[PDB]
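## Example record

The block below lists the input lines for one assembly entry, exactly as stored, with component labels intact.
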Amino acid sequence: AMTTTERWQKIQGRAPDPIFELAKRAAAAKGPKANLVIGAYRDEQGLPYPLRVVRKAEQLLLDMNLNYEYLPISGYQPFIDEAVKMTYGDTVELENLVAVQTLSGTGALSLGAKLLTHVFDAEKTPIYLADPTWPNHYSIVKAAGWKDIRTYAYYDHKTLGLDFEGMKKDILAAPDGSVFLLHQCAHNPTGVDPSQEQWNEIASLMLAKHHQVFFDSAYQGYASGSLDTDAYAARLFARRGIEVLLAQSFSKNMGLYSERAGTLSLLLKDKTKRADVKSVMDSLIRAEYTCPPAHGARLAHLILSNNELRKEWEAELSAMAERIRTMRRTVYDELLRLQTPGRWEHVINQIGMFSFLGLSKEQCEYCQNHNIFITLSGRANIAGLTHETALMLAQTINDAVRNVN
Amino acid sequence: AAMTTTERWQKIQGRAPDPIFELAKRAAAAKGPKANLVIGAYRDEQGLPYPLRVVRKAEQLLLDMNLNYEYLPISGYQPFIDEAVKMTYGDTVELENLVAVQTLSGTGALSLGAKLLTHVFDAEKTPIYLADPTWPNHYSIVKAAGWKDIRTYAYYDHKTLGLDFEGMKKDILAAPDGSVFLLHQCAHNPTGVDPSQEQWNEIASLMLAKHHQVFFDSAYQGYASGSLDTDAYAARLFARRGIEVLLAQSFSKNMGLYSERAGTLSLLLKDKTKRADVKSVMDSLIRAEYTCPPAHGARLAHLILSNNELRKEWEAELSAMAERIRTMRRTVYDELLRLQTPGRWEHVINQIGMFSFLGLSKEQCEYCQNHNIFITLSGRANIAGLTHETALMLAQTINDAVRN
Ligand SMILES: C[As](C)(=O)[O-]
Ligand SMILES: C[As](C)(=O)[O-]
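Predicted structure tokens for the full assembly:
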């Protein structure tokens, strides 16, 4: 603390991201293995799967010779409009909402959490996250300045299902005018979503308590294989009059992980305030990164907008969702043939890319040590499996259960 | 007292608009003959957006590589980082003794760097010094990163239209030891005024004696003079003088990659264990903001930096862009001489890079704007948006503004 060298010498290091680390360990791991850490889709051969429609869009886009001039702060409008239309339906009135392009879902979550501090007192108003949830959610929200982060009950670790009664109690027990970060479909990590009727009950509670709803929509398409089906909760909440804030990602459903394409949108009840909310969002973006990367949004716009590419895309995503169910069925069937102790129906009843297996930290540690790389919380990327490794996963679960529990 | 969400959203405070934004909009919508010289992007000799030929080549090469779209590491695409830092510092002892990450271009590196520095300095008490004048977004970025005592150092001499080097030195010395100084590495924005080599060396010495932290904004290497070496002088000199340089790098102007957002943040730091701690803070800050950076811009810049043939093509293509800006500076100058406009006008050809402080009063800049010559009220013009034709128009309108 006199020369700059001395000043830097005192910088406090930070722990590394456990997920991204484990994925690195898995990727380095030796013989036959299952790298099931990160939620990234793999094909039948277990290899990365750039979508055929994205390969088509690459060539279309290159032939068009668009320029590289700065986007507006808010980003590439053709993409934003199509993207909001994909989640809210061709019905949606673009004029009654505010929406910007973001750095995928993470970017929309960070941006939205910061925005909310201009409307709510982030020193006092709680923000509620699901129990359990993406551990990065807590980090993002905290970094954005939220000082009272809480949990709503969601998953029942005994029944390996939804704890809906606990969720309702926690919504009602929260102070009025709190923020709730909800998973729009394919809850991460549990893979269990409310029913349609349960979503409508949640909406009525959010209304009666004057809560702010923040949807995280990272997996639209993966809960059912159908984009329209999976948009049910967002569309319901819109129809019910909720001022929905929603963070959207194209990393998983279009496979654009590396290009960072997403949106942040707000259904603003008072149209005269749209300009003011846009001006805050734009100042937040301007002071971080000035404007977003164009390539991913340009690619996604072509795929959303063109009727042929859009239908090809939806068929490709439907097939992706179906390979995941086949993998679930393969693991489940093998768990039955080995007569592994316990119930395993949640492997096939859960939806999305993951299975939340319900194993102990020690059983998970066992798995990792036999080259089955699932998280310590028991989360497994089913979309990482091949027929070979789905069988290995079951065999290792069977071993872990019979030998540690 | 707001109760419903709609009532809370009702109370949100709109954030005042960028006056440059409003002017640029006026300029872009204007009919009739005009010169839109507001926003800082390169235009070619026909006044048009200029995708680089080497970037169009690299696009096709990348497509033919059949690459996937899987996440980059949090810190970004490491071959890009390595080539990017080798470009600014050269193939030298530095490359092993630094920490660097990919960022969302210069802006991203500036925000990340300003946040990072709050983990080494007390942003509540330690002053951070910006140039007088500077890019208005500098103030926004630092304020938003948490800096509470934002100050300025004398830089442009509004009388001489050159550098106020004595005043700069005085402010460097008068600041408390251990302050942060955000320096423009080359092509100062908005003025085009840069210190000489010998002046940069005096500055390095002052920074060492005062134990100031140096934060370089490096948005224009190569693009300023046409030479990557020339334009890297300050960074390399400061490195050689032993300064722990924090540096924000952009490929927006020098590769025309405005839309793809490719940049780096790097720190020169000797101890290897501490390099890894610094890294861990950079990665933590990234992760909570956007998880990892976009790949397409980084893959384009890496291929151009690394492919020996594209690298050579690019340096020639950049040299020609820089030359064309000088050419426009020369055209304006000659016309102002030709028209015998009152006053000194040599600053038009002594300034370097895209931007020029023309030296006009507010009333004269208003006159330019009302005659469809869109420069800012502080007299900033983007020389690089001129054509031979609008260069002459500018000089003639300046000559009218000055005369009435
Ligand atoms: C983790 As994401 C939705 O920012 O690719
Ligand atoms: C203005 As920039 C250096 O972030 O493209």
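Chain A has two domains: 17-49+322-401, 50-321. The longest helix of chain A spans residues 307-337.
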